[PDB]
Amino acid sequence: YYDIDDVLADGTEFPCKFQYDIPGLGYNPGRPITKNTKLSLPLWLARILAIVGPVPFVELLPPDMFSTKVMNAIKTDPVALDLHSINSHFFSLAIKWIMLFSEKELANVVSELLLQRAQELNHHASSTSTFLLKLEEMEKEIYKKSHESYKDTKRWMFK
Amino acid sequence: DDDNTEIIKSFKNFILEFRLDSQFIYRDQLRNNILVKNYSLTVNMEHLIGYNEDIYKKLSDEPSDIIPLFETAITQVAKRISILSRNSLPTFQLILNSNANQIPLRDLDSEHVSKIVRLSGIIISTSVLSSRATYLSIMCRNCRHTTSITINNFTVSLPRSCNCGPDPYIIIHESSKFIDQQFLKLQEIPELVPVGEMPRNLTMTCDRYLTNKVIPGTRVTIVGIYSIYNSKNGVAIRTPYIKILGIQSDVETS
Amino acid sequence: LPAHLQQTFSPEEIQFIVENEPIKIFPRITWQLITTDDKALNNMVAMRSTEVVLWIALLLKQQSKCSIVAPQWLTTKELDRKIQYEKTHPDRFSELPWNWLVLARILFNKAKDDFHDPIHELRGKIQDLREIRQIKVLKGLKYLNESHLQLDNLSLLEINELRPFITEIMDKLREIHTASL
Amino acid sequence: MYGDLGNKLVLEAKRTKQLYARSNQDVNLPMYHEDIIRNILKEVSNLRKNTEYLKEQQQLGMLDDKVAKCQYFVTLLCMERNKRCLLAYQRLRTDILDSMAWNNNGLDLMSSITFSQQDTNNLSHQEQEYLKEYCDLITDLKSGDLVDIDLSGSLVPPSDVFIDVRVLKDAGEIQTEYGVFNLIKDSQFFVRQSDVERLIQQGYLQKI
Amino acid sequence: DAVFGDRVRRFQEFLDTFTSYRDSVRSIQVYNSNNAANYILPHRIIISLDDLREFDRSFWSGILVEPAYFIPPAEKALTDLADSMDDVPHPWKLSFKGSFGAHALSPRTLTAQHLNKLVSVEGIVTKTSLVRPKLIRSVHYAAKTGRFHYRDYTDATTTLTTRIPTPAIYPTEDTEGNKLTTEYGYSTFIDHQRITVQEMPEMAPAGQLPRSIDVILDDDLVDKTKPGDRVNVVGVFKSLGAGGMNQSNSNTLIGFKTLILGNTVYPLH
């Protein structure tokens, strides 16, 4: 799609291994790529390779970002967790990977994390410090929008 | 202590009713401070003296007996703002920075002791943090009296009464609330007034939210009270330090 | 291309809206004009109250040719029952004129000398009722779920300030959840 | 490595949004990148060339192999990727642009599109043709109404309704419409909102 | 203190459902008896914080917020479960893996909001104070009245919680007037040490001097690290000593020196 956040979200590398052999390597002098080779692929191409096959072309090995250690650590203290370090995209990204693999379990998890950030982001919606530095890019953009509504409504409040 | 009620009522009435046309600068200073979890307040003395001359008349008289009644006075206000009922909320630190008249380092000699003194010097080195106490529980070695001591500022011995004696009181560290402290040590600026002699350095204790606020080597202008501590090294010879409330670095400095 | 804001209203635009609400006035005057949407009036009688739209009252107040009446809900003795009723129902936001913030900004700029005991009082009152109500919104905002919210009785300005936030993270939240079934 | 140049390009696209965001909005886009997108177009031409080559090769050599499909699938995606970049950038460029053509033309008495848009020739002429065609496109909307509009102006509502404008080193007097305001540096005109809207966009007036 | 009982009955349940730890305790109980049949292992059971959140969040937030009231009833519960094991022929220790953190802090950022709360420090360890015994259980033998007589010595770092100090020396002729000889080698000595920890040299902000805080290492943990090693300590953050407020001497603002007890010491590279 046209927005920069999505097309940038597709740019991220995933550890997906090939189910099959594919001569005509476009990545170098294989020429074919031996079966079960683990090659990092951006999301854009890797997205429909898991569908089209009745065995798919790729295994979809779970990304290091989604490692159960992480999905566990985000259940402790999200508010102090640094998202911007790990990817940095999370919600723009994770939203695709939850549909792609059709995982229910973590929905209830991320659906919680994003409330817990936001009950914090209505707190920096009032007129940073260090914290603004650790938000995910898209989340950050929402912070601009909120902070601007508030600032403007305050500047209207007086003269 | 109906007088402390009388003073604190005036401080509440100073925070809630203060108007710079038309926003309430302090009252919003408060909210916007508790939300970021700053737990501090910065009073501008000019507004203060504008509001009542009186409370500044007493605040420049005996600061160290008053200023904590101002702290409790403001935290009793954040109780009615930041939360509502019918925790825990530390008593906020106030940082007051104001113009007045700069009093150079060389010119501090007695006579203004326990009277707020604005001044200017380059910080030498910052001392490593250490905690003082704010609220600590205490039990007796024998009768096991459970006493919650609210220690305030600004040393203070423990009470001996519930043999028993002489001082049978233990500090419970599992429930004790602690704050932080710094110890800046500042050398007055090289431009004035060294003359032919090495410039003196007064030892300063920052605390709570002013701590680690300043990188050593940066020019600053401190405000704070001026006061003396013992520190055996006679007779009697007590040595000088400047408590800081509150610090403001020079432009900008970020 | 509206640029700003654009999805939320502008703080000014909600005043632009509220000024379309009529309120009573005390004209000093004793053409026509039909205008368009007014419907009023036969020549206003001095020392006689009448009902007209706001932006004209404000307009005729700059020229001090009319004295606006104070709203019955704008009083400190009246506000007292309202914060009393608000502290005691931490959940619901009570009963609001829905414009009260913006009328509280507008009628204080000029009309201020018309109010009985306007000084250092009501502003202290509404700056308060605009405090506990705001934190009550931030503590009622933890219960966020898709798709429902009761925001009950809430000012237009209060709606407008937090709108991008709520209706954005609802659009990140509901977006995973609709799509995960 | 395969489609990544587009990720870098949109990464660069992002910074113009950063410059339009807070911001402050003066426009002044650095330049349109013709070079880097030329690289992209040479890369994609490479791609489609190997694509039709292999499309010839399946007809002979590959003989409809199961593997062949992949090349027409994966590499095809890459084409799309470049597209996904190329339009995403481009629309962004039109978004930063048409709005500018909105808020100022410019404004009374437009009366012609000139001296505006500091980018000028530095920005690509391909966009500028679109642009001039676009303001020509909006002249017709100006010509349907009969409001009067003044659609370009008055995004912010009038109050009330007379203001005070303080001259800002402008000469002047160029106020021919309605009346000769007789512009004079260091002169404030207690003038209604009407001609204020029109004259403030130019750069003459300063304090509202 | 029925609530301390509650903490024990609560931590009981956590074990054996799920049973994933119990097999490790059994392994510890078996291996030493295997050494008994032969012809060394520290007794402590590493608890992953990972698992604690699944059962109770209420008890999870507690271990971090107020470890003094929680770690010791959980501990007494662990001994209690180790004694119901097999069979006959010690306090143990908790560990706390994690699932960090909050509480994630380097030593440079700490004090006081992080005090009396579990903490994982990390940095360089220097200079590693020299390993030394520490007395705990007093054991004596009366004669000819016999029996067996023991005192229990409570130091500053005993358990976690503060207690009326027992020390020092020996009772000697506890009533009635019978002679008491010190029985050495039945009586228990836990080794004890402290090691200061400096923040990582590479994350140092400026020419500003490094700030190190001291970590006491109980029992097994002793001699586990040479100085100059990358270390991530864990432990409860303890403030011990009076600030001078106890007695007149001395006169000065300086006070309440702080250190970390325990606990794990995972090395890293």
Side-chain angles (χ1 to χ4, degrees), chain A residues 68-69 71-77 80-81, chain E residues 50 53-54 57 60 64 99-103:
Chain A
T68 185
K69 170 175 55 55
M71 81 173 50
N72 64 34
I74 67 184
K75 307 176 58 64
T76 48
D77 279 335
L81 195 139
Chain E
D50 180 23
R53 291 172 283 169
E54 285 62 6
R57 171 63 173 195
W60 158 263
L64 308 179
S99 285
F100 290 141
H103 305 157

CSV table of all heavy atoms in Angstrom, one decimal, chain A residues 68-69 71-77 80-81, chain E residues 50 53-54 57 60 64 99-103:
chain,number,residue,atom,x,y,z
A,68,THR,N,9.8,-16.9,22.3
A,68,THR,CA,8.8,-17.0,23.4
A,68,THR,C,9.4,-16.3,24.7
A,68,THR,O,8.7,-16.0,25.6
A,68,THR,CB,8.5,-18.4,23.8
A,68,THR,OG1,7.5,-18.4,24.8
A,68,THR,CG2,9.7,-19.2,24.2
A,69,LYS,N,10.7,-16.1,24.7
A,69,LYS,CA,11.4,-15.3,25.7
A,69,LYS,C,10.8,-13.9,25.7
A,69,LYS,O,10.6,-13.3,26.8
A,69,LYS,CB,12.9,-15.3,25.5
A,69,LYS,CG,13.6,-14.3,26.5
A,69,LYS,CD,15.1,-14.4,26.4
A,69,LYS,CE,15.5,-14.2,24.9
A,69,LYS,NZ,15.0,-12.9,24.3
A,71,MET,N,8.0,-12.6,24.0
A,71,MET,CA,6.5,-12.7,24.3
A,71,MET,C,6.3,-12.9,25.7
A,71,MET,O,5.2,-12.7,26.2
A,71,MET,CB,5.8,-13.7,23.4
A,71,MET,CG,5.9,-15.1,24.0
A,71,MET,SD,4.9,-16.3,23.1
A,71,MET,CE,5.4,-16.0,21.4
A,72,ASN,N,7.3,-13.5,26.4
A,72,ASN,CA,7.1,-13.6,27.9
A,72,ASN,C,7.6,-12.3,28.6
A,72,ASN,O,6.9,-11.9,29.5
A,72,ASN,CB,7.9,-14.8,28.4
A,72,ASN,CG,9.4,-14.6,28.2
A,72,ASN,OD1,10.0,-13.5,28.2
A,72,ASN,ND2,10.1,-15.8,28.0
A,73,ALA,N,8.6,-11.7,28.1
A,73,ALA,CA,9.2,-10.5,28.8
A,73,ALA,C,8.3,-9.3,28.6
A,73,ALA,O,8.3,-8.3,29.4
A,73,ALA,CB,10.6,-10.1,28.2
A,74,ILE,N,7.4,-9.3,27.6
A,74,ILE,CA,6.5,-8.2,27.4
A,74,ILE,C,5.2,-8.4,28.2
A,74,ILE,O,4.3,-7.5,28.2
A,74,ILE,CB,6.1,-8.1,25.9
A,74,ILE,CG1,5.2,-9.4,25.5
A,74,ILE,CG2,7.3,-8.0,25.0
A,74,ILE,CD1,4.9,-9.4,24.0
A,75,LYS,N,5.2,-9.5,29.0
A,75,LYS,CA,4.0,-9.7,29.9
A,75,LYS,C,4.4,-9.2,31.3
A,75,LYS,O,3.5,-9.2,32.2
A,75,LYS,CB,3.6,-11.2,29.9
A,75,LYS,CG,3.4,-11.7,28.5
A,75,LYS,CD,3.1,-13.2,28.6
A,75,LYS,CE,1.9,-13.5,29.5
A,75,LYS,NZ,0.6,-12.9,29.0
A,76,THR,N,5.6,-8.8,31.5
A,76,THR,CA,6.1,-8.3,32.8
A,76,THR,C,5.9,-6.8,33.0
A,76,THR,O,5.0,-6.4,33.7
A,76,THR,CB,7.6,-8.6,33.1
A,76,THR,OG1,8.3,-8.2,31.9
A,76,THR,CG2,7.8,-10.0,33.4
A,77,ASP,N,6.7,-6.1,32.3
A,77,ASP,CA,6.7,-4.6,32.3
A,77,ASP,C,6.8,-4.1,30.8
A,77,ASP,O,7.9,-3.9,30.3
A,77,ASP,CB,7.8,-4.0,33.1
A,77,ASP,CG,7.5,-4.0,34.6
A,77,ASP,OD1,6.2,-4.0,35.0
A,77,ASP,OD2,8.4,-4.0,35.5
A,80,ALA,N,8.2,-0.2,30.6
A,80,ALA,CA,9.6,0.0,30.6
A,80,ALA,C,10.4,-0.8,29.5
A,80,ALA,O,11.6,-0.7,29.4
A,80,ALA,CB,10.1,-0.4,32.0
A,81,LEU,N,9.6,-1.6,28.8
A,81,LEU,CA,10.3,-2.4,27.7
A,81,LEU,C,10.6,-1.5,26.6
A,81,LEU,O,9.9,-0.5,26.3
A,81,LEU,CB,9.4,-3.6,27.3
A,81,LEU,CG,10.0,-4.7,26.4
A,81,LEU,CD1,9.6,-6.1,26.8
A,81,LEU,CD2,9.8,-4.4,24.9
E,50,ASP,N,9.9,-17.0,34.7
E,50,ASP,CA,9.0,-17.2,33.6
E,50,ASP,C,7.7,-17.8,34.0
E,50,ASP,O,6.6,-17.3,33.7
E,50,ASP,CB,9.8,-18.2,32.6
E,50,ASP,CG,9.0,-18.5,31.4
E,50,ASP,OD1,8.1,-17.7,31.0
E,50,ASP,OD2,9.3,-19.6,30.8
E,53,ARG,N,4.2,-16.2,36.5
E,53,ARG,CA,3.2,-15.3,36.0
E,53,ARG,C,2.0,-16.0,35.6
E,53,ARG,O,0.8,-15.5,35.6
E,53,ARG,CB,3.7,-14.4,34.8
E,53,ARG,CG,4.7,-13.5,35.2
E,53,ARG,CD,5.3,-12.8,34.0
E,53,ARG,NE,6.3,-13.7,33.4
E,53,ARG,CZ,6.8,-13.5,32.2
E,53,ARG,NH1,6.4,-12.4,31.5
E,53,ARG,NH2,7.7,-14.3,31.6
E,54,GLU,N,2.1,-17.3,35.2
E,54,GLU,CA,1.1,-18.1,34.7
E,54,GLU,C,0.1,-18.4,35.8
E,54,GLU,O,-1.1,-18.5,35.6
E,54,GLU,CB,1.6,-19.4,34.1
E,54,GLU,CG,2.3,-19.2,32.7
E,54,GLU,CD,3.5,-18.3,32.7
E,54,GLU,OE1,3.9,-17.9,33.8
E,54,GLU,OE2,4.0,-18.0,31.6
E,57,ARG,N,-0.4,-13.4,39.3
E,57,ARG,CA,0.3,-12.2,39.1
E,57,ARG,C,0.4,-11.4,40.4
E,57,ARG,O,1.4,-10.6,40.5
E,57,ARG,CB,-0.6,-11.3,38.1
E,57,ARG,CG,-0.2,-9.9,37.9
E,57,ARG,CD,1.2,-9.8,37.3
E,57,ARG,NE,1.5,-8.5,37.0
E,57,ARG,CZ,2.5,-8.1,36.2
E,57,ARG,NH1,3.3,-9.0,35.7
E,57,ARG,NH2,2.8,-6.8,36.0
E,60,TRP,N,3.5,-12.6,41.9
E,60,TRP,CA,4.6,-12.2,41.0
E,60,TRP,C,5.1,-10.8,41.2
E,60,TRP,O,6.3,-10.6,41.3
E,60,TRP,CB,4.2,-12.4,39.5
E,60,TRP,CG,5.0,-11.6,38.6
E,60,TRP,CD1,4.8,-10.4,38.1
E,60,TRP,CD2,6.3,-12.0,38.1
E,60,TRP,NE1,5.8,-10.0,37.2
E,60,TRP,CE2,6.7,-11.0,37.2
E,60,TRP,CE3,7.1,-13.1,38.2
E,60,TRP,CZ2,8.0,-11.0,36.6
E,60,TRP,CZ3,8.3,-13.2,37.6
E,60,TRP,CH2,8.7,-12.1,36.7
E,64,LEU,N,9.0,-8.9,43.2
E,64,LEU,CA,9.8,-7.7,42.8
E,64,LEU,C,9.6,-6.5,43.7
E,64,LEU,O,10.6,-5.8,43.9
E,64,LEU,CB,9.3,-7.4,41.3
E,64,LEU,CG,9.4,-8.6,40.4
E,64,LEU,CD1,8.9,-8.2,39.0
E,64,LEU,CD2,10.8,-9.1,40.4
E,99,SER,N,13.5,-13.5,32.5
E,99,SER,CA,12.2,-12.7,32.6
E,99,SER,C,12.4,-11.4,33.2
E,99,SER,O,11.5,-10.8,33.9
E,99,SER,CB,11.2,-13.5,33.4
E,99,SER,OG,10.6,-14.6,32.7
E,100,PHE,N,13.6,-10.8,33.0
E,100,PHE,CA,13.9,-9.4,33.3
E,100,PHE,C,13.6,-8.5,32.1
E,100,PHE,O,13.6,-9.0,30.9
E,100,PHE,CB,15.3,-9.2,33.7
E,100,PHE,CG,15.7,-9.8,35.0
E,100,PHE,CD1,16.9,-10.4,35.3
E,100,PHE,CD2,14.7,-9.6,36.1
E,100,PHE,CE1,17.1,-10.9,36.5
E,100,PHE,CE2,15.0,-10.1,37.3
E,100,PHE,CZ,16.2,-10.8,37.5
E,101,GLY,N,13.2,-7.3,32.3
E,101,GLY,CA,13.1,-6.7,33.7
E,101,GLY,C,12.6,-5.3,33.9
E,101,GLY,O,12.1,-4.7,33.0
E,102,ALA,N,12.8,-4.8,35.1
E,102,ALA,CA,12.1,-3.6,35.5
E,102,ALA,C,13.0,-2.5,36.0
E,102,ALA,O,13.0,-1.4,35.3
E,102,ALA,CB,11.0,-3.9,36.5
E,103,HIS,N,13.9,-2.6,37.0
E,103,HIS,CA,14.6,-3.7,37.7
E,103,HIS,C,15.6,-4.3,36.8
E,103,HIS,O,16.1,-5.4,37.0
E,103,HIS,CB,13.7,-4.7,38.3
E,103,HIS,CG,12.7,-4.2,39.3
E,103,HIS,ND1,11.5,-4.9,39.5
E,103,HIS,CD2,12.6,-3.1,40.0
E,103,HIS,CE1,10.8,-4.2,40.4
E,103,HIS,NE2,11.5,-3.1,40.7
